[PDB]
Design an enzyme around this catalytic site. Structure first.
Site, short mmCIF file in Angstrom:
data_model
loop_
_atom_site.label_atom_id
_atom_site.label_comp_id
_atom_site.label_asym_id
_atom_site.label_seq_id
_atom_site.Cartn_x
_atom_site.Cartn_y
_atom_site.Cartn_z
N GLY A 18 96.44 -30.29 33.71
CA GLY A 18 97.89 -30.28 33.59
C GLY A 18 98.35 -29.86 32.22
N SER A 22 103.91 -29.10 24.50
CA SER A 22 102.88 -28.38 23.75
C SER A 22 101.49 -28.93 24.04
CB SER A 22 103.21 -28.44 22.25
OG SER A 22 102.03 -28.45 21.46
N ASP A 131 110.40 -45.22 32.42
CA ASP A 131 110.37 -44.14 33.40
C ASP A 131 109.09 -44.20 34.23
OD1 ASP A 131 111.71 -41.82 34.60
OD2 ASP A 131 110.23 -40.57 33.56
C1 FZL Z 1 90.38 -34.02 38.09
O1 FZL Z 1 91.26 -34.98 37.56
C2 FZL Z 1 92.60 -34.95 37.94
C3 FZL Z 1 93.15 -34.08 38.87
C4 FZL Z 1 94.52 -34.15 39.14
N1 FZL Z 1 95.12 -33.27 40.13
C5 FZL Z 1 96.63 -33.28 40.54
C6 FZL Z 1 96.73 -32.42 41.83
C7 FZL Z 1 95.62 -31.66 41.86
C8 FZL Z 1 94.50 -32.34 40.92
O2 FZL Z 1 93.35 -32.06 40.90
C9 FZL Z 1 95.34 -35.11 38.50
C10 FZL Z 1 94.78 -35.99 37.58
C11 FZL Z 1 93.42 -35.90 37.30
N2 FZL Z 1 92.73 -36.78 36.33
C12 FZL Z 1 93.31 -37.06 35.01
N3 FZL Z 1 94.48 -36.54 34.73
C13 FZL Z 1 95.06 -36.77 33.56
N4 FZL Z 1 96.36 -36.13 33.30
C14 FZL Z 1 97.19 -35.66 34.40
C15 FZL Z 1 98.07 -34.49 33.89
C16 FZL Z 1 99.23 -34.07 34.81
C17 FZL Z 1 99.96 -35.25 35.45
C18 FZL Z 1 99.02 -36.33 36.01
C19 FZL Z 1 97.99 -36.81 34.97
C20 FZL Z 1 94.40 -37.60 32.60
C21 FZL Z 1 94.67 -38.06 31.30
C22 FZL Z 1 95.88 -37.74 30.50
N5 FZL Z 1 96.79 -37.49 29.90
C23 FZL Z 1 93.60 -38.88 30.90
N6 FZL Z 1 92.72 -38.92 31.89
C24 FZL Z 1 93.19 -38.14 32.94
N7 FZL Z 1 92.68 -37.84 34.18
#
Ligand code: FZL
Length: 266
Positions: A18, A22, A131
Protein backbone atom coordinates in the site's frame (compact mmCIF):
# COMPACT_ATOMS: atom_id res chain seq x y z
CA UNK A 1 14.96 -7.97 -7.30
CA UNK A 2 14.42 -4.51 -5.78
CA UNK A 3 15.85 -4.59 -2.26
CA UNK A 4 15.92 -2.62 0.99
CA UNK A 5 18.53 -2.65 3.75
CA UNK A 6 17.60 -1.47 7.24
CA UNK A 7 20.34 -1.02 9.78
CA UNK A 8 22.48 -3.90 8.52
CA UNK A 9 19.87 -6.34 7.18
CA UNK A 10 18.86 -6.88 3.56
CA UNK A 11 15.23 -7.53 2.65
CA UNK A 12 13.69 -8.54 -0.68
CA UNK A 13 10.54 -6.83 -1.95
CA UNK A 14 7.87 -9.39 -2.82
CA UNK A 15 5.33 -6.67 -3.60
CA UNK A 16 4.00 -3.32 -2.46
CA UNK A 17 1.01 -3.63 -0.15
CA UNK A 18 0.00 0.00 0.00
CA UNK A 19 0.78 3.66 -0.18
CA UNK A 20 -0.40 6.98 1.16
CA UNK A 21 0.93 10.48 1.31
CA UNK A 22 4.68 10.11 1.08
CA UNK A 23 4.62 6.55 2.45
CA UNK A 24 4.85 3.06 1.02
CA UNK A 25 4.46 -0.33 2.68
CA UNK A 26 6.12 -3.43 1.28
CA UNK A 27 5.84 -7.15 1.88
CA UNK A 28 9.41 -8.44 2.08
CA UNK A 29 11.55 -11.43 3.02
CA UNK A 30 14.57 -11.16 5.28
CA UNK A 31 17.75 -13.13 4.58
CA UNK A 32 16.46 -16.34 6.18
CA UNK A 33 13.32 -16.11 3.97
CA UNK A 34 10.92 -15.01 6.72
CA UNK A 35 8.16 -12.57 5.94
CA UNK A 36 7.96 -8.96 7.19
CA UNK A 37 6.36 -5.66 6.27
CA UNK A 38 8.50 -2.55 5.75
CA UNK A 39 7.00 0.96 5.76
CA UNK A 40 8.98 3.58 3.84
CA UNK A 41 8.53 7.33 4.34
CA UNK A 42 10.22 9.86 2.06
CA UNK A 43 10.98 12.81 4.32
CA UNK A 44 12.70 14.89 1.60
CA UNK A 45 9.72 17.22 1.55
CA UNK A 46 7.71 17.19 4.75
CA UNK A 47 6.31 19.86 7.04
CA UNK A 48 7.50 20.05 10.64
CA UNK A 49 4.00 18.78 11.55
CA UNK A 50 4.14 15.42 9.68
CA UNK A 51 7.74 14.91 10.78
CA UNK A 52 6.43 15.07 14.33
CA UNK A 53 3.45 12.83 13.51
CA UNK A 54 5.81 10.18 12.07
CA UNK A 55 8.10 10.50 15.12
CA UNK A 56 5.06 10.26 17.38
CA UNK A 57 3.83 7.02 15.78
CA UNK A 58 7.24 5.34 16.11
CA UNK A 59 7.57 6.22 19.80
CA UNK A 60 4.04 5.07 20.67
CA UNK A 61 4.51 1.92 18.57
CA UNK A 62 7.68 1.16 20.55
CA UNK A 63 6.03 2.07 23.84
CA UNK A 64 2.75 0.18 23.27
CA UNK A 65 3.89 -3.19 21.96
CA UNK A 66 5.35 -3.98 25.35
CA UNK A 67 1.82 -3.93 26.81
CA UNK A 68 -0.16 -5.96 24.26
CA UNK A 69 0.37 -8.35 21.36
CA UNK A 70 -2.79 -7.05 19.62
CA UNK A 71 -0.67 -4.13 18.40
CA UNK A 72 1.39 -4.83 15.27
CA UNK A 73 5.06 -5.14 16.29
CA UNK A 74 7.81 -2.76 15.23
CA UNK A 75 10.97 -4.85 15.11
CA UNK A 76 13.55 -2.40 13.77
CA UNK A 77 13.49 0.99 12.19
CA UNK A 78 15.86 3.49 10.68
CA UNK A 79 15.18 7.22 10.65
CA UNK A 80 17.30 9.91 9.03
CA UNK A 81 16.57 13.42 7.84
CA UNK A 82 15.67 11.93 4.43
CA UNK A 83 13.78 8.68 5.07
CA UNK A 84 12.11 6.35 7.54
CA UNK A 85 12.21 2.56 7.26
CA UNK A 86 10.07 0.53 9.67
CA UNK A 87 10.39 -3.26 9.85
CA UNK A 88 7.09 -4.62 11.18
CA UNK A 89 4.97 -7.68 11.61
CA UNK A 90 3.30 -8.40 8.34
CA UNK A 91 -0.44 -9.05 8.31
CA UNK A 92 -2.13 -11.61 6.04
CA UNK A 93 -4.57 -8.89 4.95
CA UNK A 94 -6.45 -5.98 6.44
CA UNK A 95 -9.90 -6.53 7.93
CA UNK A 96 -11.55 -4.16 5.44
CA UNK A 97 -10.20 -6.04 2.41
CA UNK A 98 -11.22 -9.30 4.03
CA UNK A 99 -14.74 -8.23 5.00
CA UNK A 100 -15.43 -7.38 1.36
CA UNK A 101 -15.09 -11.11 0.53
CA UNK A 102 -18.25 -12.02 2.51
CA UNK A 103 -17.99 -15.09 9.56
CA UNK A 104 -18.13 -17.93 12.07
CA UNK A 105 -19.84 -16.61 15.24
CA UNK A 106 -16.82 -17.74 17.25
CA UNK A 107 -14.28 -16.03 15.01
CA UNK A 108 -16.41 -12.89 15.28
CA UNK A 109 -16.39 -12.70 19.06
CA UNK A 110 -12.72 -13.67 19.15
CA UNK A 111 -11.95 -10.81 16.72
CA UNK A 112 -14.02 -8.45 18.89
CA UNK A 113 -12.01 -9.37 22.00
CA UNK A 114 -8.88 -8.66 19.94
CA UNK A 115 -10.05 -5.14 18.98
CA UNK A 116 -11.13 -4.24 22.53
CA UNK A 117 -7.80 -5.35 23.94
CA UNK A 118 -5.91 -3.23 21.38
CA UNK A 119 -8.04 -0.11 21.71
CA UNK A 120 -8.13 -0.49 25.51
CA UNK A 121 -4.35 -0.42 25.74
CA UNK A 122 -3.95 2.64 23.53
CA UNK A 123 -6.59 4.31 25.74
CA UNK A 124 -4.55 3.50 28.85
CA UNK A 125 -1.63 5.45 27.30
CA UNK A 126 -3.66 8.54 26.51
CA UNK A 127 -4.60 8.00 22.85
CA UNK A 128 -8.09 8.31 21.43
CA UNK A 129 -7.84 7.07 17.83
CA UNK A 130 -10.93 8.97 16.55
CA UNK A 131 -11.04 7.47 13.05
CA UNK A 132 -11.19 3.74 13.77
CA UNK A 133 -12.33 1.54 10.91
CA UNK A 134 -11.70 -1.98 9.54
CA UNK A 135 -8.57 -0.89 7.64
CA UNK A 136 -6.91 -0.20 11.01
CA UNK A 137 -6.90 -3.94 11.88
CA UNK A 138 -4.73 -6.66 10.33
CA UNK A 139 -5.46 -10.40 10.36
CA UNK A 140 -2.39 -12.29 11.54
CA UNK A 141 -1.94 -15.48 13.56
CA UNK A 142 -5.71 -15.87 13.47
CA UNK A 143 -6.01 -12.58 15.44
CA UNK A 144 -6.84 -8.95 14.71
CA UNK A 145 -4.01 -6.47 15.43
CA UNK A 146 -4.18 -2.67 15.38
CA UNK A 147 -1.89 -0.90 12.89
CA UNK A 148 -2.70 2.83 13.29
CA UNK A 149 -3.25 5.38 16.03
CA UNK A 150 -5.05 7.90 13.82
CA UNK A 151 -1.90 9.95 14.33
CA UNK A 152 0.00 9.37 11.09
CA UNK A 153 -1.03 9.27 7.40
CA UNK A 154 -3.79 6.78 6.53
CA UNK A 155 -2.55 4.63 3.65
CA UNK A 156 -4.64 2.72 1.13
CA UNK A 157 -4.23 -0.71 -0.48
CA UNK A 158 -2.55 -0.88 -3.85
CA UNK A 159 -4.22 -2.89 -6.57
CA UNK A 160 -2.46 -4.06 -9.72
CA UNK A 161 -5.17 -2.42 -11.86
CA UNK A 162 -4.94 1.22 -10.64
CA UNK A 163 -8.01 3.07 -9.28
CA UNK A 164 -11.28 7.16 -1.19
CA UNK A 165 -11.99 7.33 2.57
CA UNK A 166 -15.08 5.95 4.28
CA UNK A 167 -17.46 7.71 6.63
CA UNK A 168 -19.75 4.95 7.84
CA UNK A 169 -17.78 4.71 11.13
CA UNK A 170 -17.77 8.35 12.19
CA UNK A 171 -19.38 8.92 15.62
CA UNK A 172 -22.11 11.52 16.23
CA UNK A 173 -19.92 13.66 18.51
CA UNK A 174 -17.38 14.13 15.73
CA UNK A 175 -20.03 15.50 13.36
CA UNK A 176 -21.70 17.85 15.90
CA UNK A 177 -18.23 19.19 16.84
CA UNK A 178 -17.47 21.04 13.60
CA UNK A 179 -18.69 24.29 15.24
CA UNK A 180 -10.18 16.53 23.66
CA UNK A 181 -12.71 13.98 22.33
CA UNK A 182 -13.81 11.03 24.41
CA UNK A 183 -12.57 7.45 24.58
CA UNK A 184 -16.29 6.85 23.93
CA UNK A 185 -16.03 7.79 20.24
CA UNK A 186 -13.77 4.79 19.59
CA UNK A 187 -16.59 2.68 21.10
CA UNK A 188 -18.96 4.00 18.42
CA UNK A 189 -16.55 3.08 15.62
CA UNK A 190 -15.92 -0.39 17.04
CA UNK A 191 -19.68 -0.95 17.28
CA UNK A 192 -20.01 -0.11 13.56
CA UNK A 193 -17.31 -2.65 12.81
CA UNK A 194 -18.97 -5.30 14.98
CA UNK A 195 -22.35 -4.37 13.47
CA UNK A 196 -20.82 -4.83 10.03
CA UNK A 197 -19.35 -8.13 11.22
CA UNK A 198 -22.78 -9.35 12.31
CA UNK A 199 -25.41 -7.74 10.03
CA UNK A 200 -23.31 -7.67 6.85
CA UNK A 201 -23.38 -3.85 6.65
CA UNK A 202 -22.62 -0.67 8.57
CA UNK A 203 -25.59 1.03 10.29
CA UNK A 204 -26.01 3.56 7.45
CA UNK A 205 -24.49 1.78 4.43
CA UNK A 206 -27.90 2.20 2.74
CA UNK A 207 -28.06 6.03 2.86
CA UNK A 208 -25.74 6.23 -0.14
CA UNK A 209 -26.00 10.04 -0.22
CA UNK A 210 -23.34 11.37 2.11
CA UNK A 211 -24.94 14.46 3.65
CA UNK A 212 -28.19 12.59 4.32
CA UNK A 213 -25.95 9.91 5.78
CA UNK A 214 -24.25 12.46 8.03
CA UNK A 215 -27.67 13.54 9.26
CA UNK A 216 -28.82 10.02 10.10
CA UNK A 217 -25.77 9.50 12.33
CA UNK A 218 -26.69 12.60 14.36
CA UNK A 219 -30.48 12.17 14.32
CA UNK A 220 -32.09 11.20 17.67
CA UNK A 221 -35.31 10.15 15.90
CA UNK A 222 -33.59 7.88 13.36
CA UNK A 223 -33.62 4.34 14.76
CA UNK A 224 -30.83 1.84 14.08
CA UNK A 225 -32.10 -1.59 13.10
CA UNK A 226 -31.02 -4.51 15.30
CA UNK A 227 -32.61 -7.59 13.71
CA UNK A 228 -33.17 -10.34 16.28
CA UNK A 229 -30.37 -12.89 16.27
CA UNK A 230 -29.49 -16.06 18.21
CA UNK A 231 -26.70 -14.33 20.19
CA UNK A 232 -28.67 -11.85 22.27
CA UNK A 233 -25.61 -10.61 24.16
CA UNK A 234 -24.21 -9.65 20.74
CA UNK A 235 -27.42 -7.69 20.16
CA UNK A 236 -26.97 -5.97 23.54
CA UNK A 237 -23.32 -5.07 22.75
CA UNK A 238 -24.29 -3.44 19.47
CA UNK A 239 -27.16 -1.58 21.15
CA UNK A 240 -24.92 -0.05 23.83
CA UNK A 241 -22.01 0.81 21.50
CA UNK A 242 -24.30 2.67 19.13
CA UNK A 243 -26.01 5.00 21.60
CA UNK A 244 -25.75 8.52 20.21
CA UNK A 245 -25.15 10.21 23.55
CA UNK A 246 -21.48 9.52 24.42
CA UNK A 247 -22.33 9.89 28.11
CA UNK A 248 -24.85 7.02 27.85
CA UNK A 249 -22.72 4.88 25.50
CA UNK A 250 -20.95 1.87 27.00
CA UNK A 251 -17.28 2.24 27.90
CA UNK A 252 -14.38 -0.06 27.01
CA UNK A 253 -13.87 -1.16 30.66
CA UNK A 254 -17.59 -2.06 30.77
CA UNK A 255 -17.42 -3.85 27.42
CA UNK A 256 -14.64 -6.05 28.85
CA UNK A 257 -16.99 -7.29 31.60
CA UNK A 258 -19.87 -7.85 29.19
CA UNK A 259 -21.25 -11.42 28.79
CA UNK A 260 -20.61 -11.47 25.03
CA UNK A 261 -16.91 -11.23 25.98
CA UNK A 262 -16.91 -13.18 29.29
CA UNK A 263 -19.30 -16.15 28.84
CA UNK A 264 -17.50 -18.19 26.24
CA UNK A 265 -20.33 -19.80 24.21
CA UNK A 266 -23.00 -18.12 22.03
C1 FZL B 1 0.39 -9.22 2.34
O1 FZL B 1 0.00 -8.38 3.39
C2 FZL B 1 -1.11 -7.55 3.23
C3 FZL B 1 -1.92 -7.52 2.10
C4 FZL B 1 -2.99 -6.63 2.07
N1 FZL B 1 -3.89 -6.59 0.91
C5 FZL B 1 -5.13 -5.65 0.78
C6 FZL B 1 -5.94 -6.19 -0.44
C7 FZL B 1 -5.08 -6.95 -1.15
C8 FZL B 1 -3.86 -7.39 -0.20
O2 FZL B 1 -3.06 -8.22 -0.44
C9 FZL B 1 -3.27 -5.76 3.16
C10 FZL B 1 -2.45 -5.81 4.29
C11 FZL B 1 -1.37 -6.69 4.31
N2 FZL B 1 -0.44 -6.81 5.45
C12 FZL B 1 0.11 -5.61 6.11
N3 FZL B 1 -0.28 -4.44 5.68
C13 FZL B 1 0.17 -3.33 6.24
N4 FZL B 1 -0.29 -2.04 5.69
C14 FZL B 1 -1.49 -1.97 4.89
C15 FZL B 1 -1.38 -0.77 3.92
C16 FZL B 1 -2.67 -0.34 3.21
C17 FZL B 1 -3.90 -0.35 4.14
C18 FZL B 1 -4.00 -1.61 5.01
C19 FZL B 1 -2.71 -1.89 5.80
C20 FZL B 1 1.09 -3.42 7.34
C21 FZL B 1 1.78 -2.51 8.16
C22 FZL B 1 1.70 -1.03 8.08
N5 FZL B 1 1.64 0.08 8.01
C23 FZL B 1 2.53 -3.26 9.08
N6 FZL B 1 2.34 -4.55 8.83
C24 FZL B 1 1.45 -4.67 7.76
N7 FZL B 1 0.93 -5.75 7.12
Amino acid sequence: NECISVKGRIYSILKQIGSGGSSKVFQVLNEKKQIYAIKYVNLEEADNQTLDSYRNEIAYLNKLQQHSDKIIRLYDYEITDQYIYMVMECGNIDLNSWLKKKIDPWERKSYWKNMLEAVHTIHQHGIVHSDLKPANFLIVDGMLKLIDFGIANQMQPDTTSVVVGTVNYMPPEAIKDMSKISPKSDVWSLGCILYYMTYGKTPFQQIINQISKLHAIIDPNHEIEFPDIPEKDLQDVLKCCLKRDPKQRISIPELLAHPYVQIQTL
